């Protein structure tokens, strides 16, 4: 079983978005009004599941084939998962979901008038390699309207979930694409106070990883909380 041998650098809650960010309407009724209780790290918090033995399908990470071919811009999304100290996070679970090229989600509740793509599902998962690298093949999602302000549009984005070494490092975030003019107008993006933090969520075009006459590539690296050994405890 798991062992209590590590400590995780405390989260900077001024870096992450706050719970109450009024322009993002839904957060008003879904943010706690009491202060969070801080607790010392114990084995309960410093351990977590290891997915090295989950049976992954051959096309788990290939959105072009896991659902003919979908319509849309063919891209590879890749990067590395490292910690705050810059150490790679090997064999960790990376899960992603997105809309189709038209910004339509394959979910009941999505009534947007842009059609479903018969060949597109939009769900993927990948286990990082020995070096902390992951990659997915998909089509670039389209922006999509939502009922927030009267004319709000989320920039094109891919949802991401990363496990890391413990429940303490588990994170859900969103990737945005370089140059998208919708970025700065989005109230969900604006939930983040430091513009420097917003920069970390922007995937960069990566011509070096592209397959000529095939698909383009985007680079998105992820940094989880720093892990250290316990000392003088």
């Amino acid at each position: 079983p798991a062992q209590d041998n590590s400590r995780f650098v405390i989260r900077d809650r001024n870096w992450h978005p706050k719970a109450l960010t009024p322009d993002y309407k839904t957060s008003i009724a879904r943010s706690p009004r009491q202060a969070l209780v801080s607790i010392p790290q114990s084995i309960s918090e410093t351990t977590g599941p290891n997915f090295s033995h989950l049976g992954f399908g051959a096309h788990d990470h290939d959105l072009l084939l896991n659902f003919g071919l979908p319509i849309g811009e063919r891209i590879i999304v890749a990067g590395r998962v490292v910690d705050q100290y810059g150490k790679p996070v090997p064999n960790t679970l990376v899960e992603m979901w997105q809309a189709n090229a038209g910004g339509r989600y394959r979910h009941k509740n999505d009534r947007y008038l842009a059609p479903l793509d018969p060949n597109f599902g939009g769900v993927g998962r990948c286990l990082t390699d020995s070096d902390g690298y992951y990659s997915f093949r998909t089509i670039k999602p389209g922006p999509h309207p939502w009922r927030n302000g009267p004319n709000d549009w989320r920039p094109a984005h891919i949802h991401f979930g990363i496990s890391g070494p413990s429940i303490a490092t588990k994170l859900i975030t969103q990737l945005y694409f370089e140059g998208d003019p919708l970025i700065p107008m989005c109230p969900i993006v604006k939930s983040i106070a430091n513009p420097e933090a917003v920069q970390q969520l922007i995937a960069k075009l990566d011509m070096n990883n592209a397959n000529p006459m095939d698909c383009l590539a985007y680079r998105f690296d992820i940094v989880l909380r720093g892990q250290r050994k316990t000392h003088f405890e």
């Binding site: 079983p1 798991a2 788990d60 705050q84 859900i172 933090a197 940094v223």
Partner: protein, 200 residues
């Protein structure tokens, strides 16, 4: 001072979380192997229990789009990190609430006792992480049991909560569902009876 690389910022899970993390729940075709709500096989050692609950917003309305992640020890008070569907018991799982099912359910075993870093025993508990549209950064909590009063009184973690009244928000109420031992754990995100959430 010393500054390390900043942690990638969190973002809400959004309304369609289920299509990525709860395939079945989303009413979409699932893959060969999915991480779900059945931590224990009928043959796993320990007392088999059923956990259930509802999530409420600050207006007292049900949250029908939440996603929950759980982590707990086995009956021995041991954390089983090697996730495998072949295992009789997994320490990790996932559950959700939907428009279809406003209540979540988890099939597991009562966790054994674990000691904190100082070597003091914590009462039996399940670590929970809550995600949903409207939640910018996930909320952490713990589920304790009403039939472990003697233990709860001495838990060093529960004892960190300044006000006793707030401590009770963490206690699941024991019941029975189809003649089975069940515990009900409702989470109130905001307002009257607001559930305690931690930072660590």
């Amino acid at each position: 001072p010393i500054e390390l690389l900043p942690e990638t910022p969190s973002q809400t899970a959004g309304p369609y979380v289920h299509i990525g993390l709860a395939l079945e729940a989303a009413g979409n075709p699932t893959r060969d192997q999915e991480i779900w709500n059945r931590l224990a096989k009928p043959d796993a050692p320990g007392e088999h229990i059923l956990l259930l609950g509802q999530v409420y917003d600050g207006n007292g309305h049900l949250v029908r789009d939440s996603f929950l992640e759980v982590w707990q020890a086995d009956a021995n008070g041991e954390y089983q990190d090697a996730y495998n569907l072949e295992n009789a018991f997994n320490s990790f799982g996932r559950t959700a609430t939907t428009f279809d099912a406003g209540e979540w359910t988890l099939h597991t075993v009562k966790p054994g006792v674990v000691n904190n870093a100082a070597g003091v025993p914590m009462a039996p508990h399940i670590n929970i992480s809550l995600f949903a549209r409207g939640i910018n950064i996930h909320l952490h909590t713990r589920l304790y049991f009403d039939d472990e009063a003697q233990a709860n009184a001495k838990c060093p973690v529960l004892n960190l909560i300044e006000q006793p009244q707030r401590r009770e928000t963490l206690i699941a109420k024991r019941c029975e569902v189809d003649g089975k031992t069940a515990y009900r754990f409702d989470i109130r995100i905001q307002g009257e009876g607001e559930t305690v959430f931690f930072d660590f």
